[PDB]
């Protein structure tokens, strides 16, 4: 898994894994490449 700068991959105990970005301020269930 490539980790891009500004992104945090955070898995909550409910089984909620959201990829969030502080750069553009966006979150997605998909794995970001860039």
């Amino acid at each position: 898994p490539g980790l891009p700068s500004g992104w945090e991959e955070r898995k909550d105990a409910k089984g909620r894994t959201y990829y969030v970005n502080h750069n553009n301020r966006t979150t997605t269930w998909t794995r970001p490449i860039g």
Partner: peptide
Amino acid sequence: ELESPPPPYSRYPMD
């Protein structure tokens, strides 16, 4: 994941 679209991101993540 087929999950409903992630919670609106402002500054910090909240779920």
